[PDB]
Amino acid sequence: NSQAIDNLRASLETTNQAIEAIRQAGQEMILAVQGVQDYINN
Amino acid sequence: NSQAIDNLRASLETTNQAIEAIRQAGQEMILAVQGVQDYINN
Amino acid sequence: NSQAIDNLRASLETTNQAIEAIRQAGQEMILAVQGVQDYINN
Amino acid sequence: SLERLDVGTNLGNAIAKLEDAKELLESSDQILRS
Amino acid sequence: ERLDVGTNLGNAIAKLEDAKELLESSDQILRS
Amino acid sequence: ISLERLDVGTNLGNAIAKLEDAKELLESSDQILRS
Ligand SMILES: [Mg+2]
Ligand SMILES: [Mg+2]
Ligand SMILES: [Mg+2]
Ligand SMILES: [Mg+2]
């Protein structure tokens, strides 16, 4: 059971990092769309 | 171990809320791209 | 305790699948923004 | 005659994936509650 | 009018901020 | 002359790279769970 709990902790810390990577991808997508708007308005 | 289990549950509930926030951010990104398309066309 | 670990594993597997769906949504949004750029340029 | 911009296929695919994600997060939450 | 999708992009930014706060809270629960 | 065109490829390319990082990290989480 300790090994299983260790495996769950390891998996969740890695899953939280995967989410952080998608969060950062989202930030870059927002910058891309803002760049499209800024181009169109210029 | 029982403490590690209750802690894993509370962490995963919080992770799930983080993911729901990123999911709604993605909806907002899509709405922005739709707004760019509508402007270009209309 | 055994059933609680099984429950946490089932939830984390399901959470990972949700994240993967959001990751794929992100890939599709990027294709859409690249399509907008290509339209504006060409 | 300029053709219309249409990225709705990719955006509609993204929308559907975010709907799938919502169903899965709700499933995950309900597994935890049980 | 100009093109303005700032309401939706600002909302996306705000939601990603919320996600960051929640991920930091989740990571602290694990730590603690 | 590139300034005559729209180019948001730096931001898109950064997003693509982070979605690839996420996929690697999810595959690792899945592998640890399976193990
Ligand atoms: Mg660890
Ligand atoms: Mg579906
Ligand atoms: Mg404004
Ligand atoms: Mg906030």
CSV table of C-alpha atoms and ligand atoms in Angstrom, one decimal:
chain,number,residue,atom,x,y,z
A,1,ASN,CA,0.0,0.0,0.0
A,2,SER,CA,2.9,2.4,0.8
A,3,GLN,CA,4.4,1.7,-2.8
A,4,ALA,CA,0.9,2.3,-4.4
A,5,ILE,CA,0.5,5.6,-2.4
A,6,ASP,CA,4.1,6.6,-3.5
A,7,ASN,CA,3.0,5.7,-7.2
A,8,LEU,CA,-0.1,7.9,-6.8
A,9,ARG,CA,1.9,10.9,-5.4
A,10,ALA,CA,4.5,10.5,-8.3
A,11,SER,CA,1.7,10.4,-10.9
A,12,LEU,CA,-0.2,13.4,-9.5
A,13,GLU,CA,3.1,15.6,-9.2
A,14,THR,CA,3.8,14.7,-12.9
A,15,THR,CA,0.0,15.4,-13.9
A,16,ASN,CA,0.3,18.9,-12.2
A,17,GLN,CA,3.4,19.6,-14.3
A,18,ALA,CA,1.4,18.5,-17.5
A,19,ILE,CA,-1.3,21.0,-16.5
A,20,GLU,CA,1.2,23.8,-16.0
A,21,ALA,CA,2.6,23.1,-19.6
A,22,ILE,CA,-1.0,23.4,-21.0
A,23,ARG,CA,-1.4,26.6,-19.0
A,24,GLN,CA,1.8,28.0,-20.5
A,25,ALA,CA,0.6,26.9,-24.0
A,26,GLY,CA,-2.6,28.9,-23.3
A,27,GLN,CA,-0.7,32.0,-22.5
A,28,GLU,CA,1.2,31.7,-25.8
A,29,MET,CA,-2.1,31.1,-27.7
A,30,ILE,CA,-3.5,34.3,-26.2
A,31,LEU,CA,-0.4,36.3,-27.3
A,32,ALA,CA,-0.9,34.9,-30.8
A,33,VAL,CA,-4.5,35.9,-31.0
A,34,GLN,CA,-3.7,39.4,-29.6
A,35,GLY,CA,-1.0,39.7,-32.3
A,36,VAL,CA,-3.6,38.9,-35.0
A,37,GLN,CA,-5.9,41.6,-33.6
A,38,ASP,CA,-3.1,44.1,-33.4
A,39,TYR,CA,-2.1,43.4,-37.0
A,40,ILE,CA,-5.7,43.7,-38.3
A,41,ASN,CA,-6.2,47.1,-36.5
A,42,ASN,CA,-2.8,48.4,-37.8
B,1,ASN,CA,-0.5,6.2,4.9
B,2,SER,CA,-4.2,7.1,5.7
B,3,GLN,CA,-3.1,10.8,6.0
B,4,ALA,CA,-1.2,10.4,2.6
B,5,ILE,CA,-4.5,9.1,1.1
B,6,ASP,CA,-6.7,12.0,2.5
B,7,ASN,CA,-4.0,14.4,1.3
B,8,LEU,CA,-3.9,12.8,-2.2
B,9,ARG,CA,-7.8,13.2,-2.4
B,10,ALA,CA,-7.6,16.9,-1.4
B,11,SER,CA,-4.8,17.6,-3.9
B,12,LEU,CA,-6.6,15.8,-6.7
B,13,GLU,CA,-9.9,17.8,-6.0
B,14,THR,CA,-7.9,21.0,-6.2
B,15,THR,CA,-6.1,19.8,-9.4
B,16,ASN,CA,-9.5,19.1,-10.9
B,17,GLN,CA,-10.6,22.7,-10.2
B,18,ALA,CA,-7.3,24.0,-11.8
B,19,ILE,CA,-8.1,21.9,-15.0
B,20,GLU,CA,-11.7,23.3,-15.1
B,21,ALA,CA,-10.2,26.9,-15.1
B,22,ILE,CA,-7.9,26.0,-18.0
B,23,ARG,CA,-10.9,24.4,-19.8
B,24,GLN,CA,-12.9,27.6,-19.5
B,25,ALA,CA,-9.8,29.7,-20.5
B,26,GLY,CA,-9.8,27.5,-23.7
B,27,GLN,CA,-13.5,28.3,-24.3
B,28,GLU,CA,-12.6,32.0,-24.1
B,29,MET,CA,-9.7,31.6,-26.6
B,30,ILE,CA,-12.1,29.9,-29.0
B,31,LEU,CA,-14.7,32.8,-28.6
B,32,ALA,CA,-11.8,35.3,-29.4
B,33,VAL,CA,-10.8,33.4,-32.6
B,34,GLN,CA,-14.6,33.3,-33.6
B,35,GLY,CA,-14.7,37.1,-33.0
B,36,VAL,CA,-11.7,37.6,-35.3
B,37,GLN,CA,-13.2,35.4,-38.0
B,38,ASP,CA,-16.6,37.3,-37.8
B,39,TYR,CA,-14.8,40.7,-38.0
B,40,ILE,CA,-12.8,39.6,-41.1
B,41,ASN,CA,-15.9,38.2,-42.8
B,42,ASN,CA,-18.6,40.8,-41.7
C,1,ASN,CA,-7.6,1.6,2.5
C,2,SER,CA,-7.2,-0.7,-0.6
C,3,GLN,CA,-10.5,0.5,-2.1
C,4,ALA,CA,-9.6,4.1,-1.4
C,5,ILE,CA,-6.3,3.7,-3.4
C,6,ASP,CA,-8.3,2.0,-6.2
C,7,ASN,CA,-10.7,5.0,-6.1
C,8,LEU,CA,-7.8,7.6,-6.3
C,9,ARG,CA,-6.2,5.7,-9.2
C,10,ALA,CA,-9.5,5.6,-11.1
C,11,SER,CA,-10.0,9.4,-10.5
C,12,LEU,CA,-6.4,10.3,-11.5
C,13,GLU,CA,-6.7,8.1,-14.7
C,14,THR,CA,-9.9,10.0,-15.6
C,15,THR,CA,-8.3,13.4,-14.7
C,16,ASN,CA,-5.4,12.5,-17.1
C,17,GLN,CA,-7.9,11.8,-19.9
C,18,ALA,CA,-9.6,15.2,-19.3
C,19,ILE,CA,-6.2,16.9,-19.6
C,20,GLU,CA,-5.4,15.0,-22.8
C,21,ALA,CA,-8.8,16.2,-24.3
C,22,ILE,CA,-7.8,19.8,-23.4
C,23,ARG,CA,-4.3,19.3,-24.9
C,24,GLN,CA,-6.0,18.2,-28.1
C,25,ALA,CA,-8.4,21.1,-28.1
C,26,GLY,CA,-5.3,23.3,-27.8
C,27,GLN,CA,-3.8,21.7,-31.0
C,28,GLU,CA,-7.0,22.3,-32.9
C,29,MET,CA,-7.1,26.0,-31.7
C,30,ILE,CA,-3.5,26.4,-33.0
C,31,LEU,CA,-4.6,25.0,-36.4
C,32,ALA,CA,-7.4,27.6,-36.4
C,33,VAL,CA,-5.1,30.5,-35.7
C,34,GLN,CA,-2.6,29.3,-38.3
C,35,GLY,CA,-5.6,29.2,-40.7
C,36,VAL,CA,-6.5,32.8,-39.9
C,37,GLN,CA,-2.9,33.9,-40.5
C,38,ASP,CA,-2.7,32.1,-43.8
C,39,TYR,CA,-6.1,33.7,-44.9
C,40,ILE,CA,-4.8,37.2,-44.0
C,41,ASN,CA,-1.5,36.7,-45.8
C,42,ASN,CA,-2.6,34.7,-48.9
D,1,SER,CA,-14.2,37.3,-55.6
D,2,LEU,CA,-12.6,36.8,-52.1
D,3,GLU,CA,-13.6,33.4,-50.5
D,4,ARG,CA,-14.9,33.6,-46.8
D,5,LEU,CA,-12.6,32.8,-43.9
D,6,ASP,CA,-13.8,29.6,-42.2
D,7,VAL,CA,-11.8,28.0,-39.4
D,8,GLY,CA,-15.0,26.5,-37.9
D,9,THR,CA,-14.0,22.9,-38.4
D,10,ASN,CA,-10.9,23.3,-36.2
D,11,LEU,CA,-12.7,25.5,-33.7
D,12,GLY,CA,-15.7,23.0,-33.6
D,13,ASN,CA,-13.3,20.2,-33.0
D,14,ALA,CA,-11.7,22.2,-30.1
D,15,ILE,CA,-15.2,22.9,-28.6
D,16,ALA,CA,-16.1,19.2,-28.7
D,17,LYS,CA,-12.8,18.3,-27.0
D,18,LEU,CA,-13.5,20.9,-24.2
D,19,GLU,CA,-17.0,19.3,-23.8
D,20,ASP,CA,-15.4,15.9,-23.5
D,21,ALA,CA,-13.0,17.3,-20.9
D,22,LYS,CA,-15.9,18.6,-18.9
D,23,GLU,CA,-17.6,15.2,-18.8
D,24,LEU,CA,-14.4,13.5,-17.7
D,25,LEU,CA,-13.6,16.1,-14.9
D,26,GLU,CA,-17.2,15.6,-13.6
D,27,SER,CA,-16.6,11.8,-13.7
D,28,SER,CA,-13.3,12.2,-11.8
D,29,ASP,CA,-15.0,14.4,-9.1
D,30,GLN,CA,-17.8,11.8,-8.7
D,31,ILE,CA,-15.3,8.9,-8.4
D,32,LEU,CA,-13.6,10.8,-5.5
D,33,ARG,CA,-17.0,11.6,-3.8
D,34,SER,CA,-17.7,7.8,-3.7
E,1,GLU,CA,-15.5,49.7,-35.6
E,2,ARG,CA,-12.0,48.3,-34.7
E,3,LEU,CA,-11.6,44.6,-34.0
E,4,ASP,CA,-11.8,44.0,-30.2
E,5,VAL,CA,-11.8,40.5,-28.7
E,6,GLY,CA,-10.2,41.8,-25.5
E,7,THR,CA,-13.1,40.7,-23.3
E,8,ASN,CA,-12.6,37.1,-24.3
E,9,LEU,CA,-8.8,37.2,-24.3
E,10,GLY,CA,-8.8,39.0,-20.9
E,11,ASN,CA,-11.2,36.4,-19.6
E,12,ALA,CA,-8.8,33.6,-20.8
E,13,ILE,CA,-5.9,35.4,-19.0
E,14,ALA,CA,-8.0,35.6,-15.8
E,15,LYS,CA,-8.9,31.9,-16.0
E,16,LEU,CA,-5.3,30.9,-16.5
E,17,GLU,CA,-4.4,33.0,-13.4
E,18,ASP,CA,-7.1,31.1,-11.4
E,19,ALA,CA,-5.6,27.8,-12.7
E,20,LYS,CA,-2.1,28.8,-11.6
E,21,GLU,CA,-3.4,29.7,-8.0
E,22,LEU,CA,-5.2,26.3,-7.9
E,23,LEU,CA,-2.2,24.3,-9.1
E,24,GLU,CA,0.0,26.0,-6.5
E,25,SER,CA,-2.6,25.1,-3.8
E,26,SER,CA,-2.8,21.5,-5.1
E,27,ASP,CA,1.1,21.2,-5.0
E,28,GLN,CA,1.1,22.7,-1.4
E,29,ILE,CA,-1.5,20.1,-0.2
E,30,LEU,CA,0.8,17.3,-1.6
E,31,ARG,CA,3.9,19.0,0.0
E,32,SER,CA,2.1,19.4,3.4
F,1,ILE,CA,9.7,42.9,-46.4
F,2,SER,CA,8.5,40.3,-43.9
F,3,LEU,CA,7.0,43.2,-41.9
F,4,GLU,CA,4.4,43.5,-44.8
F,5,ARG,CA,2.9,40.1,-43.4
F,6,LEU,CA,1.3,38.7,-40.3
F,7,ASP,CA,3.6,36.3,-38.4
F,8,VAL,CA,2.5,35.0,-35.0
F,9,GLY,CA,4.6,31.8,-35.5
F,10,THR,CA,6.9,32.5,-32.5
F,11,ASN,CA,3.9,32.3,-30.1
F,12,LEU,CA,2.2,29.5,-31.9
F,13,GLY,CA,5.5,27.5,-32.1
F,14,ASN,CA,6.0,28.1,-28.3
F,15,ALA,CA,2.4,26.8,-27.7
F,16,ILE,CA,3.0,23.7,-29.9
F,17,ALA,CA,6.2,23.0,-27.9
F,18,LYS,CA,4.4,23.3,-24.5
F,19,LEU,CA,1.5,21.0,-25.7
F,20,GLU,CA,4.3,18.4,-26.7
F,21,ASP,CA,5.8,18.8,-23.2
F,22,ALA,CA,2.4,18.2,-21.7
F,23,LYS,CA,1.8,15.0,-23.8
F,24,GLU,CA,5.3,13.6,-22.6
F,25,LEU,CA,4.3,14.4,-19.0
F,26,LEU,CA,0.9,12.8,-19.3
F,27,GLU,CA,2.4,9.7,-20.9
F,28,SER,CA,4.9,9.5,-17.9
F,29,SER,CA,2.0,9.9,-15.4
F,30,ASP,CA,0.0,7.1,-17.2
F,31,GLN,CA,3.1,4.9,-17.2
F,32,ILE,CA,3.7,5.4,-13.3
F,33,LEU,CA,-0.1,4.7,-12.7
F,34,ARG,CA,0.1,1.5,-14.9
F,35,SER,CA,3.2,0.3,-13.0
G,1,MG,MG,7.9,12.6,-6.2
G,2,MG,MG,-18.0,14.4,-27.3
G,3,MG,MG,-11.3,46.9,-25.5
G,4,MG,MG,-8.8,35.3,-10.3
